[PDB]
Amino acid sequence: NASSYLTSASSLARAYSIVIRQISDLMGLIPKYNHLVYSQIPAAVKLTYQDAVNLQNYVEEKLIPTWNWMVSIMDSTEAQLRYGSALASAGDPGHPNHPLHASQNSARRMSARGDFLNYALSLMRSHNDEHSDVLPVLDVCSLKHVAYVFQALIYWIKAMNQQTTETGQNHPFFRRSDSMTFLGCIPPNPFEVPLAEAIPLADQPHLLQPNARKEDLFGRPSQGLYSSSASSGKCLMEVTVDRNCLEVLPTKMSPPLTSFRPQCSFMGMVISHDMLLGRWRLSLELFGRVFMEDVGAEPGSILTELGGFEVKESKFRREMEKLRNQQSRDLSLEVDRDRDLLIQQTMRQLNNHFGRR
Amino acid sequence: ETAQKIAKAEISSSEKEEDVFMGMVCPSGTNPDDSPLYVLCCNDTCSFTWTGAEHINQDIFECRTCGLLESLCCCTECARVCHKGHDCKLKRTSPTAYCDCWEKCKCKTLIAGQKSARLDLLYRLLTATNLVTLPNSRGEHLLLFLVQTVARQTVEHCQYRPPRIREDSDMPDHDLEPPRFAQLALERVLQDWNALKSMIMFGSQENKDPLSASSRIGHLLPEEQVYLNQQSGTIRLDCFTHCLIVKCTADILLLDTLLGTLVKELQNKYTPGRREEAIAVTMRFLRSVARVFVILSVEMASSKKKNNFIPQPIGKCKRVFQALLPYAVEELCNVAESLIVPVRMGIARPTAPFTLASTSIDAMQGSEELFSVEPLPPRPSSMLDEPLERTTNSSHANGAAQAPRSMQWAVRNNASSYLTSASSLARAYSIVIRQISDLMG
Amino acid sequence: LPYAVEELCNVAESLIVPVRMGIARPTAPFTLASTSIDAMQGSEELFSVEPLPPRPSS
Amino acid sequence: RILGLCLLQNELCPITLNRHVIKVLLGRKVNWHDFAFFDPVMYESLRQLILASQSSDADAVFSAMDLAFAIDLCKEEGGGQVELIPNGVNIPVTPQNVYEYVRKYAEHRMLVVAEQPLHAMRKGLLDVLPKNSLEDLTAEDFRLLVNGCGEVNVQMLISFTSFNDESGENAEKLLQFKRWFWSIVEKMSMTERQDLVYFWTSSPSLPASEEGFQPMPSITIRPPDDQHLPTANTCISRLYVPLYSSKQILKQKLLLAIKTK
Ligand SMILES: [Zn+2]
Ligand SMILES: [Zn+2]
């Protein structure tokens, strides 16, 4: 009873995601195609290495335009989110226009003509990189199709890249683990910056929240972009808001079967999923926090795997419910409000009941 | 002139003519509002000098320091001279009234200076030093402040009533014309390419203003620093072009003089290096003019009644585009692709439908609500209408309230359909294309 | 596989052309099925049809 | 085991251990940055030491009082003297090899003195939960589940709190009463709010999200009664409060009630 363009686009994008995932899953069988298909199914088609590599360059040459479109869109939205965060950490909360202002939530609690004029002015300013001191007009909640296509392409990249697959000063003990490491960015030096900035969570034991970004939780990492020691179109940093210039950027960027060795080079440079995720970290986390009822159910989604606290706690609670429905005994405790007899009864009962060699 | 005479004879031992003249005409470290030229342009005369005593429409500032409140109101002219530094403020509700700071404080604006000497001093100070490139205390260039004063005066001075021929003695003298200085000052300041370059290029990588979050970025991380450095400043430029095109409808010679100056500056051959600078100035100016033209053409409706065929704001924009055709068309093409790219890339942000103004008076709204906005001020140092609720399982539609707060500025949760927003963007693109075609013809 | 991947790429491009071109025809929202019976259903109406019959006589 | 049971029972049992304690409880790998959570003063001291190590004048600092591989152990460690590095009593600490020692210093308190307790804790935890359900978690998730909200806050109380009235004498009076109650509760500091929720749902630590509260919170605003203290039950954690037109008397009486244990 709605007939909204966005949901039709989202359904088309979901179909595209499924077909791209099927393509990637088929290509994952190439290295073992002489044992998974040509020896199991009685009806199989023989494949040759040269034809295989021709097929791979064919799939790259066919996916290039939508890939460029997705790169442009995600780059523009990530740049706009980064600019928003930078101005939020550099602007007065007092003024009505500041990001960290209760009036800009737009979800907890103005004219249509004003909204359209704001969007038109935002586009006109963003095109010519003239977007300082005033927030962009973007609805990152109105790009669900971009979300699905980004997820599909990231899945393809991860599948093929995984199919392909330091001491003293940089001692192993002085390096962050998966708890604090950020993919696609060089971890901050544990020495130069002090505790108050490198690990803000240590300074204040109350910064934890159900809505707590990992960034403010564990400081701001750095990324090796801009022309400094870089001469690639992708390596050029994303400090450009619009989508017209960010369209001419990636456009101008231009034997046994068991050793197929995919390459994923795509845009002329070796593509690793870590750096790509690091490029769009803000938009990736925002997508994981806004779109999760629909893109979450898709198997192997990058947002679900890199989900925030809510996904982790929900998964653990569901696991608790699953594992609690086969036991036959309760706690059956019997204690008292005292201290000494409480501890004595606790230890005696827990040792006697759950104790055996 | 005596200062010039004195400065001409000085020993250059770590000294310069400019370093000995700026420090003696506007010494370093001074507060911006004490800059001589800003004081020159904000002197004028008090409203009471022409409004008599009866309520005649004029804006209302309250001076809490000097006691004026609750039917004791000081005007905008006195808010910069008499009450320069008080806890003055602007009342959102503005009933008609008249200035009365004369009877409660010392209204130093009661009598005026000499007009010819005022123009001569403006001439000399403009041609002499670089005090025109510095903003006043409100982070707005001299030109923008001058144009806003012109815009206000145009609509407020029509209320002047000549003393038609047809008890009280302590009342201030109220038989002189309202200030004419803003128009002449803008006309004379638009002809100095230093001032024009400062105004049009205001907000660049080099130029920064205190009333802008981009001024103080040193304490920020390098990533935030570069992200904020890349984007140039245009809020002031958009304000200037909006006030010069849409607001000051009384006169047309202002934009004619501006275009004449830009034409003089683009064609220069003898002076070296002026081509690139004048090209950049004209490009940014035409971009802002295209923004204003696009917005105030989108808001209006192509009504067939009365066969007007052209409104005044779009008329000014058309004259500007015709005057600077070879570069105007290029900038318009840039703005057109700007407008249309999201249409064809499948990302048209949803927008609710809206009506269209039948006349320019309603069209001026929205444009005024948007262009006449000020940038985000920097972060210092490092009856209730909204009630609270305590409910559970409140999940209707939704899906946009679970994101972290720092980004929730860019996420939204009586149609607001993709298609109508795309259609409105396409109509804007069509307007730009039609103007391009009519110019090229 | 060698031709299956080609045809799948062509189909994916076919589906995605309006998405990256912004020309899609609007459609109303719907709820995904959770059982194979409803997977067969709906598809039954979509597929099991006959073409437009010819105009009889002249 | 009681911690793991509270996890399994979806209840919050506030036992807020240090970051490294729960990191090694899960069987993860300890690291040096956890020293920041351990003791920020000593972490800053070690950071300054490692910063001076890069400087070439550090040995000159070592020429001040002739530092060596010897530290003054606190009374917490049990006293006595324990050699840091064998044959290191005579050998002084040198900048060319301080880094290794620095690492040792961390494990000199993170693990050297704390091997058996943490090992026993992890072993006990492994015998009540499966390995697969243990992963996907970290220190932050474990802390937000066990300790719940790091403090007791009123806004998350508002997140899960349902009010109903069996009288309906006036909606405006009900709204005014609840506004006054929430306002006075907001002015309560840490420990008093802890006790308030200890009387509300018998646990000062609110659930991390809407899920986590096995029952649905419910407070019934009864018609006013001069002498009737609010009643609370933990079977469904439901509250019954009279429509106290007088405010401060009710506030003080509930404060003294939650004061009682
Ligand atoms: Zn006045
Ligand atoms: Zn005053």
Ligand SMILES: [Zn+2]
């Ligand atoms: Zn005055």
